[PDB]
Design a protein around this ligand. Structure first.
Ligand SMILES: OC[C@H]1O[C@@H](O[C@H]2[C@H](O)[C@@H](O)[C@H](O[C@H]3[C@H](O)[C@@H](O)[C@H](O[C@H]4[C@H](O)[C@@H](O)[C@H](O[C@H]5[C@H](O)[C@@H](O)[C@H](O[C@H]6[C@H](O)[C@@H](O)[C@H](O)O[C@@H]6CO)O[C@@H]5CO)O[C@@H]4CO)O[C@@H]3CO)O[C@@H]2CO)[C@H](O)[C@@H](O)[C@@H]1O
Ligand SMILES: [Ca+2]
Ligand SMILES: [Cl-]
Ligand SMILES: [Zn+2]
Length: 509
């Protein structure tokens, strides 16, 4: 009989949970709170005509993929920025409060949609248009598709003209400095064949941020959208890191410090959100937990359940090259936040791409719910899952926070102290609404694989809870269903036994 104690104090460690951590990149069967237009295809996206290039993902094809996949009405395929306005229109219509749009910085964007770009057509060539951050001439809402340039500030001006600036209810709140710069030479060799240098990335990041903020002073700039740890540490062995990195523990510090320096010289913040991608390298049963992980491998599924701990738990060492050789940089979120506090205080943190795998398996759902609780508890500003609508359990994990009852019910927006006596078999997150603890929300995750877990709850609150309604998902179904309410609460204490591998959302009143 596994017994775990959960202790909550609704008046302690109160901290706001950013509403934007429950987002996605793709169109999911879930209620999301942020939408990101990013990924490989956005690097060569040309807002003037909507063409883009697949890079290594599809034989370096320049075509209309983004229009097709974005579901843009065919009559608007030739309208400037239709891929993006369709994207943002959809977010607004779904009551999504944050839209993050990736801008182009690798250097060139598709000039046409004529198919594969040969190596002999590597930019510059007739297949590409050079990107310039500042037009330096009056903007036009009808960009010239005949010249050799595409302007980023003109692109942003077009969007601001249509939706208002970032401080308004319909404005696009953030822009990203391209996508995974350290992989430009690998994913987009026809655009940027040489490996990005640290100097180049900083110069471009500063120039583009300045350009964007002149048009919309309220827009938040996200960067550098690093693909993974190797990029965090050395920008994938950047050619000039041996010189530029002298005195820096890792590239993350250099980036923050240089953006801070540029901001101090310019007179305003040029980097609003440190943006990184985190695909867990955690392994189990001989395979990584994401990217083709087999739901039949129990050891992999068990490793998936514990992997979220690498984000915050100092005592957890996962089975991966990061867990083995990079302990000095783990747990990862605290290390990223520590760097921010040291080199550019006030900078926000966002995980714009991540996937814990097992999307159609209960463990993918529990891990997803665990990750969201962690993002909220540790202060992540925005997060957007990367994966499609086939990940039903991942979607259940999101809805457990954003729409647990099917009618808009959501986790509270203020995190409060909630401790569990066994962080290996369980995870628990608690929250209230605003500064009011009248309704206490609790996400309770039982990671026990084949046995129920009995939880003894002890709560310190100014309110005397009498009932706890429950919604949950498990191996029986990814659909979140209401369960029998908890009714025997004595002096804010109660015992609740949860079946193995179950994710619950308890609402006490
Ligand atoms: O003439 C006959 C009819 O033609 C129709 O048009 C056709 C057209 O002729 C044809 O060429 C086109 O073919 C498309 C395929 O149908 C479509 O499936 C394919 O989709 C690709 C896409 O090109 C590619 O860019 C995309 O890349 C993804 C990648 O899969 C994904 O793994 C990656 O995720 C990474 C993140 O990006 C990265 O940030 C993170 O760090 O890592 C992630 C994981 O690695 O994301 C990228 C995108 O960013 O993959 C998809 C799927 O494979 O594209 C083909 C070329 O466009 O189909 C057209 C029809 O649909 C005419 O319409 C009709 O009138 C004619 O009669
Ligand atoms: Ca142009
Ligand atoms: Cl990168
Ligand atoms: Zn789905």
């Amino acid at each position: 009989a596994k017994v775990v104690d959960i202790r909550i104090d609704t008046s302690a460690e109160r901290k706001p949970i950013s509403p934007y951590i429950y987002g996605s990149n793709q169109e999911l069967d879930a209620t999301v709170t942020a939408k990101r237009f990013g990924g490989n295809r956005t690097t060569g996206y040309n807002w003037e005509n909507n063409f883009s290039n697949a890079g290594s993902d599809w034989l370096h094809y320049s075509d209309t993929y983004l229009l097709e996949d974005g579901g843009v009405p065919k009559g608007e395929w030739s309208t400037p920025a239709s891929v993006v306005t369709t994207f943002h229109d959809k977010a607004l219509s779904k009551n999504v409060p944050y839209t993050l749009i990736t801008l182009q910085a690798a250097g060139y964007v598709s000039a046409d949609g004529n198919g594969p770009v040969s190596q002999e057509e590597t930019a510059p060539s007739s297949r590409w248009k050079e990107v310039k951050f500042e037009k330096g001439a009056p903007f036009s809402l009808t960009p010239d598709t005949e010249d050799d340039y595409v302007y980023m500030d003109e692109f942003v001006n077009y969007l601001v003209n249509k939706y208002g600036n970032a401080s308004t209810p319909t404005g696009i709140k953030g822009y990203s400095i391209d996508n995974q710069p350290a992989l430009w030479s690998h994913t987009h060799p026809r655009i940027h064949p040489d490996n990005v240098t640290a100097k180049e990335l900083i110069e471009k990041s500063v120039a583009l941020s300045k350009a964007v903020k002149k048009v919309d002073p309220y827009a938040e700039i996200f960067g550098p959208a690093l693909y993974g740890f190797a990029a965090y540490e050395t920008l994938q062995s950047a050619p000039d890191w041996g010189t530029e990195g002298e005195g820096y523990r890792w590239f993350i510090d250099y980036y923050l410090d240089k953006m801070k320096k540029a901001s101090d010289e310019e007179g305003k913040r040029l980097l609003d959100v440190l943006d990184v991608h985190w695909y867990p390298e955690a392994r189990g049963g001989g395979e990584r937990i994401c990217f083709g992980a087999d739901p039949r491998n129990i050891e992999t599924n068990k490793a998936r359940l514990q992997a979220p701990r690498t984000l915050w738990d100092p005592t957890y060492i996962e089975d991966s090259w990061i867990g083995q050789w990079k302990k000095d940089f783990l747990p990862i979120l605290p290390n990223l936040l520590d760097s921010i506090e040291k080199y550019y205080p006030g900078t926000k943190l966002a995980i714009t791409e991540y996937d814990y795998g097992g999307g159609n398996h209960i463990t993918g759902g529990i891990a997803q719910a665990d990750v969201l609780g962690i993002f909220g508890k540790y202060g992540v500003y925005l997060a957007t899952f990367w994966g499609d609508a086939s990940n039903n359990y991942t979607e259940a994990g999101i809805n457990l926070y954003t729409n647990y009852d099917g009618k808009g019910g959501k986790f509270g927006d203020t995190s409060v102290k909630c401790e569990t006596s066994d962080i290996e078999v369980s995870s628990a997150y608690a929250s209230i609404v605003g500064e009011d603890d009248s309704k206490l929300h609790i996400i309770l995750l039982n990671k026990n694989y084949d046995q129920p877990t009995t939880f003894n709850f002890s709560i310190d609150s100014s309110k005397n809870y009498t009932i706890g309604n429950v919604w949950a998902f498990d191996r029986g179904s990814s659909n979140i269903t209401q369960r029998t309410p908890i009714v025997n609460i004595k002096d804010n204490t109660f015992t609740y036994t949860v079946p193995a591998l179950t994710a619950c959302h308890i609402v006490l009143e």
